[PDB]
Design a protein around this ligand. Structure first.
Ligand SMILES: CCCC[N+](CCCC)(CCCC)CCCC
Ligand SMILES: [Rb+]
Ligand SMILES: [Rb+]
Ligand SMILES: [Rb+]
Lengths: 100, 97, 97, 100
């Protein structure tokens, strides 16, 4: 039951997104060079950030917003890295399933 | 065969690309700040997106195009993460020897 | 036992960051198209680089700054790739039980 | 020695870089919106591409240059994904050196 861990990440990440989304908007909004002004934008950003695609059309400029970032990133990096783990640990499940 | 899974991803992803490519063009095309106007552009984008290189010369601006995105991304992230799995599960194949 | 390796990376990376941060500033600062002028900026960059999010609001332009980069990147890529390893090797810990 | 595989990637990638570097320059150079004009630039790009950091200060615009890309990317993604594999398969080496 290591896939029970997968779903976990899934959730967490989504939370971290909404969390980071709603969190970061208010940490940036109203400051200079803010682009993470509206919540809908920030939302996108989180996605763009947790997948590290980083198109760079949106990013933090506040010493705080940049933290909300780090968290989001590592979250996603971690979450996926996790699912990569489950996919594999499963392959060794049918690799020892045949062997013994 | 867990590599039978590898090839699977490969395919899927390619589909998701063409899928997302052709899908996203029509979801963006004709809107404001539309960048994903032509299908050939979108195509590129999918690549640039599923590999998460995100040069950012192209991206979605429509609430929809951004979904086509998420799918594309996770697809690639997943697919590769998978192949990383096969590479490894294989190493433990000659480690239990 | 192998998580002792995890924490290791964590540290190293953080060092490489500060290292790269403080290192790269001075390698760029004062040159043309210099973006990595202040240390606080460079700091951010390292993060943005080691996670490969590459928003691209900051990057190196000096043949040197670009090395500081490579190191930072591979560091992060490696570090995380490592933690992905521990997560997995652990799953095969409760798979062999 | 699955690490014999690691070094392999390392090499290959470096080749693919120089390969892609020198390859892509000539595929772009002299075209419209070309930014991958000089070889030194392209070189950087390969790095920036194979690590997928994609700062986006340089990229392909030619239907060809974009292929040189795909190759470079998958190369790096693969190479690192590989090294992630060795790191792990090794951990299960001292996990079965404790488990029995
Ligand atoms: C998320 C993508 N990474 C980041 C380093 C590169 C592929 C995953 C390892
Ligand atoms: Rb990336
Ligand atoms: Rb970018
Ligand atoms: Rb990126």
């Amino acid at each position: 039951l290591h896939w029970r861990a997968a779903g976990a990440a899934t959730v967490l990440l989504v939370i971290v997104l909404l969390a980071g989304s709603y969190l970061a908007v208010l940490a940036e909004r109203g400051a200079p060079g803010a682009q993470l002004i509206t919540y809908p934008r920030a939302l996108w950003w989180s996605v763009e950030t947790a997948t590290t695609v980083g198109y760079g059309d949106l990013y933090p400029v506040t010493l705080w917003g940049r933290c909300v970032a780090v968290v989001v990133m590592v979250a996603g990096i971690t979450s996926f890295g996790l699912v990569t783990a489950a996919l594999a640990t499963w392959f060794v499940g049918r690799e020892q399933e045949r062997r013994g």
